[PDB]
Amino acid sequence: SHMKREEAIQNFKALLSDMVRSSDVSWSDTRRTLRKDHRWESGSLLEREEKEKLFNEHIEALTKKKREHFRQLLDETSAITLTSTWKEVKKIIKEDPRCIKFSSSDRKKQREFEEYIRDKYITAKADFRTLLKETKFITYRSKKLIQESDQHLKDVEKILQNDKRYLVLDCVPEERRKLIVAYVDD
């Protein structure tokens, strides 16, 4: 009968999968309402602690899934730029279930948006450093050259100007220039 406890876990898990679709809900509320469902007794072998554990894992799973689909939706919205605001973006994606079902909380959507943009920014810098390492007009002597005059940095920016990786940073001009400077230093 050892498998009976394992069977109860899977039963309780199926109950959660069926009845809890939102990551916003509390265990307190959920254990209240699920108790009204006759399927609840099928978890009798499970102590409240392990039920609550299973609930937490479930919320964790929903959270991960929703975040991934949210980010996919953002990745699919081509109007988004490094400088886009949640306020602007919300207007575009408002009807998409991946936005709607992410959470009832605007704060949590906004926060996930700002985190997405941060990651997007981080990824773009990494790619840009790759491009920089590819460019052999940029040498140990570049730093000499940069301190002597405006020219070298302009010459560099000319060579880089048409590359996909340089251009995705158009929204953060000062930042990009710093990256070039940083690479010229090291």
Return residues touching Ni ion (CB under 5 A). 2
Q: How far apart are CB 22 and Ni ion at their closest, in Å?
A: 37
Smallest distance from Ni ion to CB 45, Å: 14
Task: Using alpha carbons, select from 81, 85, 111 the residue that is nearest to residue 172.
Answer: 81
CB nearer to Ni ion: pick between 7 and 170: 7
In the complex with Ni ion, the residue whose CB is nearer, 2 or 87, is 2
Question: Smallest Cα–Cα separation from 16: which of 47, 53, 49, 65?
Answer: 53
**DSSP letter assigned to residue 136:** T
Tokens matching residue 61? 């799973």
Minimum CB distance to Ni ion smaller for 7 or for 157 = 7
Pair 101, 70: CB distance under 8 Å = no
CB of 8 vs Ni ion, minimal distance in Å? 14
Q: How far is the CB of 4 from Ni ion (least distance, A)?
A: 8
Whether the CB-CB separation of 98 and 107 falls below 8 Å is answered with no
Amino acid at 81: T
Nearest to Ni ion of 3, 87 (CB atom): 3
